[PDB]
Amino acid sequence: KVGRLIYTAGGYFRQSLSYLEAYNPSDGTWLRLADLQVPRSGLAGCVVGGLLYAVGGRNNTDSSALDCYNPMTNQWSPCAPMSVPRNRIGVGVIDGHIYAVGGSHGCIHHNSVERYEPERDEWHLVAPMLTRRIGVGVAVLNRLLYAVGGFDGTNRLNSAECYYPERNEWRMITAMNTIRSGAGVCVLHNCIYAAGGYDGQDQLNSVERYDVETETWTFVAPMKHRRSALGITVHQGRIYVLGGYDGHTFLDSVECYDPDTDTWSEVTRMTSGRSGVGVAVT
């Protein structure tokens, strides 16, 4: 069997893409899957019940689209769209529900947040963030959604806030050491990781993880390639970053961070360089 792959949807390189490819870290092999009905970039990926969802993005135009991919049918299926278009959206999953955080619709910078129930194919607004954030990293940890960095329309941000589903409220948390938009955010071993991003003048290769109990952000081993608008995911206790923009070119490099050795390896290259891809694991 081919159990658990890293899926990449959409992206940008000279134009919005429709590519859907999968990577087998047991293999080193790539798989070409069904193209997206509409090419998109700046979207987010997540998994719920073994289906892969592609949320938001822009087609070259800002998308409110939610689309479902079934790995067993290799087929894409449209879902109820969001209430608003959300370019540079962040996404997280709590109890089988997809939270769409922030993003832009043209020049509107959203601080709003909606929740999608796959059981009912319905979207509902939840409490809005304290800060408008596009290009925001999103991570779920102890059933709490975290919104990290991004751009509020005026300032690139280093702040972070925390949404509480049971109370339906947001609370700021400790700010990061660096301003980061278009960063990869994920959760590896009870910690939130924030890799790369763009600090307003440079693409970053730095990496800080947040310890919730100590409330502090500490830097860790940096990546080899500066990159923003990167895909990120966690597979078997390791972080994977995919593609992105380094300020000049569109990367195809996929680096793998080992927490037990605090080291970034290059483990493969995408079939072509791209940025703004959605990434998930199933």
- 253 lies in the binding site for ligand GED (CB under 6 A): no
Nearest to 57 by CA among 36, 43, 38: 43
Whether the Cβ atoms of residue 208 and residue 185 lie closer than 8 Å to each other: no
Residue from 116, 198, 257, 264 in contact with ligand GED (CB under 6 A):
198
**Dist. CA 158–CA 208, nearest whole Å:** 12
Residue from 182, 184, 231, 278 in contact with ligand GED (CB under 6 A):
182
Instruction: Identify residues 208-247 at the interface with ligand GED (CB under 6 A).
Output: 228-229, 245
- 160 lies in the binding site for ligand GED (CB under 6 A): no
- 8 lies in the binding site for ligand GED (CB under 6 A): no
- 273 lies in the binding site for ligand GED (CB under 6 A): no
One-letter amino acid for residue 244 of the chain: G
Residue from 181, 206, 253, 268 in contact with ligand GED (CB under 6 A):
181
- 149 lies in the binding site for ligand GED (CB under 6 A): no
**Shortest distance, position 48 Cβ to ligand GED, whole Å:** 21
DSSP conformational letter for 41: B
Whether the Cβ atoms of residue 269 and residue 23 lie closer than 8 Å to each other: no
**Shortest distance, position 83 Cβ to ligand GED, whole Å:** 19
- 42 lies in the binding site for ligand GED (CB under 6 A): yes
Nearest to 173 by CA among 123, 213, 221: 213
In this complex, which beta carbon is closest to ligand GED, that of residue 123 or of residue 198?
198
**Dist. CA 216–CA 267, nearest whole Å:** 30
List contacts with ligand GED (CB under 6 A): 12, 41-42, 57-58, 87-88, 134-135, 151, 181-182, 198, 228-229, 245, 275-276
